[PDB]
Write a protein that binds this ligand. Structure first.
Ligand SMILES: Cc1ncc(C[n+]2c([C-](O)CCC(=O)O)sc(CCOP(=O)(O)OP(=O)(O)O)c2C)c(N)n1
Ligand SMILES: Cc1ncc(C[n+]2c([C-](O)CCC(=O)O)sc(CCOP(=O)(O)OP(=O)(O)O)c2C)c(N)n1
Ligand SMILES: O=C(O)c1cc(O)c2ccccc2c1O
Ligand SMILES: O=C(O)c1cc(O)c2ccccc2c1O
Ligand SMILES: O=C(O)CCC(=O)C(=O)O
Ligand SMILES: [Cl-]
Ligand SMILES: [Mg+2]
Ligand SMILES: [Mg+2]
Lengths: 530, 538, 532
């Protein structure tokens, strides 16, 4: 067995032993040792392989596969710009804390500078965005040292996995794992074994990261939970303004529109609040003390008056019953204003589409939102997220790869369900037309590749500085033709067919035509009803 | 406002420096120098191109720079911009393209607490990173600040065009911001850089049986024009004695003159690696390539003694004829249409004055296998890193700049044609480069020929294309996708037609929309057999 | 001036964050926070230390941090400062030292037209810039809050307050050429104590040996196990295992604490594919020799008990090893570095701080079987450089003294043991102006064998390299150590090895030089191996 083949199979085996169940693969000659090894691991059921053409959107497919089931996901590609194309997904994975392993092939470092074709400054390309950039090193031709090389290769692989999952740091994130490979790259015309019982070479258990923080709940308190927030049972009774991706620890919801009309004496901040301007405006009021509770070492700088950080609260006291009544009444008032104006508005807007999707969902659903207006609109409509997994690329809230993220979240979620009978759970994506068109090529799944069992992509189509001149005109891109180009079933429907159509039992796109013209008066009328 | 003066001063100097096109994207915040650029665009002093896709925008800038050799600016607006600009910036570094990346950092705002998202590649790819510094409000010091700003902008331009280094490439230019003073007379740049020559003569004796291999970035060498030359399509041809790359292993050169950076043909890299063959590397810039460390000397031009043997010149010319005949005759006998057939058809239908944009993978090779005579043609390809990413926007930008050059010549004549030949994978990779708003510049004579064999044909020709891998190679190297290319063009309102290879020539001979896609369905399951028959007919 | 307000706020918050010492050098431009730092030093709120040599100033800051565990700042002022601070910053990263590097970039000036290197990207826990101070008194409260939280962020990353991985941080406060903090002196953003918990199941009935290196944690439930401890490694119990006993025993499993760097037998054991090695660390990083770590955690969950036979054999081989070193030392006719180390170990009392140079000194102190219980031991094991050790000793003594005097009695002793090459490397650290703080009970003991003794013990020390190894590895210098201490007005004395104990029992800063021999070092160590 030649060295490139041997090294690639040890690495793939250790990655599977480390809990990698899905791998995204992109084509190239230099990464042939990785592709062959990943191929026959897929053939023997060890992993699910996903081949894509476009490295950039492929990274967001890997992200989707990671957030959909919570497991580390590798994306493998060849040397050169194929590695650079992972930049966008790496930036998002860094801020969203996603265990994304960029498993790049390379030519031997000894050829960098020689002018060799398709060779670049690959190691360190991502700089500070990854948790680590680890090079495996060139596989030596030395049979007598096969047991030594097997130990170093496997140990390096667990380092990559641990950095990516935050096994010891509590801060998952992208890792660059660069594999210099040289010919022969294809199997020549047994692989060094790992630990017994399928154990990882270096076992590191998930650490428990604890920083208790004393907080008095008697002071009038509002909880604001953003992306990456944890669950806090002792904060469940408090009024909570929760982003759609934040897990609702309790059942005392507070609409984001209600918060500006309330006067909290202190704020408990869960995770990283990324979305609401009213949230930011209260946090930028330096005079209300903010307590930062996070699941990892990072904590948000959004308030300048963050008195303290921690992982959990040690609560004394109890919220004033009058305070709870007031906020609860303001929450119902805010959500009544939204629903009544929506019903009085004559035209279907993106908020109507968003409200319609939120009503269609049921516990067990997975909802994927494009990171601009859809996550805002769903939040405005007052989506009750208890019992449903909401996913969104809120690390940088970029537009790239949204379709691919939804396809990946569906696949990992469904596959988690077929490791337990009943019909696979529903994944419903809500993305706007510009984002859909922008990552429309993320729809492309090869005829030989896994197709989501139950993904429905709802496109809320409202047909849309001198750089902003390109929004001065509707693009008028034919959504149906786009889905035809990537052979995906599509149907243009109306907002009240949405509920029934979603209840109609593989992967499909439902396009709902929406008006953007009157959106200002819809929102103005909602501000007035408060 | 000091910042607003500063932007007009910089933009004026960028225009005086030869920048004719700037590419912007919508983003988190305002573009660097956006209002100054808008003023210049409205005045016709500069042409702006807006895209939503930051990755395709970077390669659009590549095309706008290589189509006519001008420095090109790209304006960053976002927190994914650096990431999306990465691939094109690396290509600009390796292909020596004058790409100016503009930023507007905010020195009054916090940093490191969570807009610039630095990666690691800027410190390895750019010729320079220059920051103007915040614009002081000091009306008294106006003449001095003007001089400082225009001097720095000239320094940015010189780094990008290689004015003093002969190594063009990407430059990071930052104009900081907190949220017109004249230049030189007669539109001359503030700091002038006259022609520079780097001269490294090498003594080479041409009586030794010599072959010339010219790759990307190769210079023109009149004293090597007689020698047998194995030229890449982007290599400018000095002379008259083409040597087909497939005739190379049927000859025994005693010495090789290497021009520029070759990246094509395994027989080229074998011969370049042959310890017994002296290899002389002639480049136009400070870098020089090697295969296996087998380069004996490196220079910029040759000082030649002697002449090649007649029998050696005849023998190469005969083997050249055999290779071309094997290709034409085996192609004719082949039952299915392949990408090599499409490339042969495109080559025949090319006229002088045309610009040819070649995608990576098989198209740039197949065009060489078809014996295309590139003289009179301007051939572009991203040989820098040989990506299949960004090729649609490279062809579009190259056609815009090449047509802009021609419209600027004042000639009352239809603009020259830009013909692109790319694979199906390459097309899908940069499909979103086809989305151009009506507000933006669109080519007037761009045709993109898409050779569609529903996957990556080049791998049928590699070791993983051997029949012993038939079971597994289809999925992980072939990567079929079944994309309806016609519908994809339909979606972006791009004229397209699906034709057979024999109709390709006449279709190219008749004009249509300014931007159009010609799709030729092709087969790759017989590609390995076809190439096998060519070698056996050699 | 908004910038002056900014600098004062930052210094005030750095004070509340436990920074008691700041190190400065004079430079082309004026130092960052220089005026605010001056007022703090005049008020006794902080203590300034000024040096000319920027490289020794970096290691002085390292010493001021490891001496009492406090965050220390260094004030960059020049175009050579980043280059000169490089060594210290790399050491601060690997040894996990809370070092804050202050910078003051000028955003109104051109950059890139004619002083960074490549190491800041790979070494620092964080790089944070404050941004220019806006002239807006309307928002004075909001700016005060923003500046103070950032400083807390810088302090948090430097001390490992949330990562459990202290290290160097780059803190930039730009400028162009006092609002209150929290009540009761509390930090603006308070980070309570953090635990990272990674329990490992360890069966102690299996013949187990403990190897503790730099940064090792304390483990009560492992106190009884035979423990091969490094000098800087805190001791959990009282069952020491000499490093020389290890190659004669056959442990069935190894518990590895912190980061070992010493002893070739330790590496062979940890690299043994048939011995499971469990790595217990206090931070996220973990070490491996030849990729032979079975698991990593922060603490052990123990089942079973070591076999009495196994304990007794290890303890027996400990006495065999230690007695063999002591006996071969007394039989040796010449004073060597090992002799000087043993003399120093015998002279140490609880409450002392012992600072150890690299090369033989830090190895010899273990071979001499120093009992480190009750003694703080410092060595720059992060990169094991022989650079900067004098100012590392000085800064550790200043900080250790400072901590004791914020409690009566005479300040505790700080005793340093360094080879001659180490001493000459950082000789400029002895240059201290009469305006600067000077330690009160610091004794630097230079074991001078006129070259690198450690290279006598390696492959290049074989007699077949007699002809060539003396120049390229021995590197003798013939330096007059006494004249060098005289030049800097440092108290010096050249004494024999049996004067060491008494002389250390008697000036605030003094050097004791003990002339030593490396000509016979290889034969001496051979005699110990022989008698083992
Ligand atoms: C972004 C990116 N990602 C992956 C690669 C690797 N790659 C190539 C390479 O081998 C190119 C080598 C050369 O010198 O041209 S060539 C290739 C297949 C391209 O298929 P295609 O566009 O349909 O062309 P075809 O006619 O099928 O050869 C792939 C996937 C790449 N070059 N760029
Ligand atoms: C700045 C620098 N430059 C070179 C080295 C290499 N080096 C060392 C090494 O071998 C280090 C080994 C260890 O783990 O301590 S040890 C060493 C000799 C030190 O001589 P010394 O101070 O007189 O010690 P001695 O007691 O004579 O062994 C040298 C030259 C270094 N460590 N740092
Ligand atoms: O809590 C989280 O998950 C989280 C994640 C992040 O990526 C952050 C980035 C900067 C600042 C705070 C962050 C944060 O609190
Ligand atoms: O000749 C050229 O244009 C050229 C361009 C490059 O990007 C090179 C990179 C490495 C080594 C040689 C190179 C080279 O010779
Ligand atoms: O596919 C090819 O032939 C070129 C790609 C290459 O050289 C590589 O393996 O990196
Ligand atoms: Cl021959
Ligand atoms: Mg193809
Ligand atoms: Mg010595």
């Amino acid at each position: 067995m030649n060295p490139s083949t041997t090294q690639a199979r040890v690495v793939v085996d250790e990655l599977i032993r480390g809990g990698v169940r899905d791998v995204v693969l992109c084509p190239g000659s230099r990464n042939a040792p990785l592709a062959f090894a990943l191929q026959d691991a897929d053939r023997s059921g060890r992993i699910r392989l996903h081949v894509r053409i476009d490295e950039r959107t492929a990274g967001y497919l890997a992200i989707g596969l990671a957030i959909g089931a919570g497991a580390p996901v590798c994306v493998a590609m060849t040397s050169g710009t194929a590695v650079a194309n992972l930049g966008p997904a790496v930036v998002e994975a860094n801020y969203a804390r996603v265990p994304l392993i960029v498993l790049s092939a390379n030519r031997p470092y000894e050829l960098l500078g020689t002018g060799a074709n398709q060779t670049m400054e690959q190691l360190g390309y991502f700089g500070t965005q990854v948790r680590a950039s680890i090079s495996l090193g060139l596989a030596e031709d030395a049979p007598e040292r096969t047991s030594a090389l097997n130990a170093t290769w496997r140990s390096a692989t667990c380092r990559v996995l641990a950095a990516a999952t935050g096994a010891r740091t509590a801060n998952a994130g992208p890792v660059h794992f660069d594999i210099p490979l040289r010919e022969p790259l294809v199997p020549d015309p047994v692989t060094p074994p790992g630990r017994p019982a399928g154990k990882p070479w270096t076992y590191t258990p998930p650490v428990t990261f604890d920083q208790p923080l004393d907080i008095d709940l008697s002071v009038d308190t509002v909880v604001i939970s953003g992306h990456g927030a944890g669950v806090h049972p002792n904060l469940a009774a408090l009024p909570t303004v929760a982003e759609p991706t934040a897990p609702r620890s309790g059942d005392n919801p507070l609409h984001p529109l209600a918060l500006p009309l309330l006067r909290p004496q202190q704020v408990i901040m869960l995770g990283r609040p990324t979305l609401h301007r009213p949230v930011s405006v209260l946090l930028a009021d330096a005079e209300v003390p903010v307590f930062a509770l996070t699941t990892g070492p990072r904590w948000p700088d959004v308030s300048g008056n963050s008195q303290a950080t921690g992982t959990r609260a040690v609560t004394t006291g109890a919220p004033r019953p009058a305070w709870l009544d007031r906020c609860a009444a303001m929450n119902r008032h805010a959500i009544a204003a939204v629903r009544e104006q929506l019903a009085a508005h004559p035209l279907t807007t993106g908020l109507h589409v968003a409200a319609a999707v939120s009503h269609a969902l049921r516990p067990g659903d997975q909802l994927v939102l494009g990171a601009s207006n859809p996550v805002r609109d769903v939040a405005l409509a007052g989506l009750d997220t208890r019992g449903i997994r909401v996913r969104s690329n809120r690390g940088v809230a970029g537009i790239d790869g949204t379709v691919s993220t939804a396809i990946g979240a569906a696949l990992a979620y469904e596959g988690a369900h077929e490791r337990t009978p009943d019909s696979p759970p529903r994944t419903i994506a809500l993305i706007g037309d510009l984002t859909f068109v922008h990552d429309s090529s993320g729809l492309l799944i090869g005829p030989t590749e896994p197709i989501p069992r139950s993904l429905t992509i709802v496109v809320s189509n409202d047909n849309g500085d001198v750089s902003s001149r390109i929004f001065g005109t509707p693009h008028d891109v034919d959504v149906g033709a786009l889905c035809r180009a990537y052979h995906v079933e599509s149907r243009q429907i109306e907002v009240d067919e949405l509920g029934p159509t979603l209840d109609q039992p593989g992967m499909r796109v439902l396009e709902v035509k929406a008006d953007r013209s009157s959106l200002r008066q819809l929102h103005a009328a909602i501000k007035a009803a408060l």
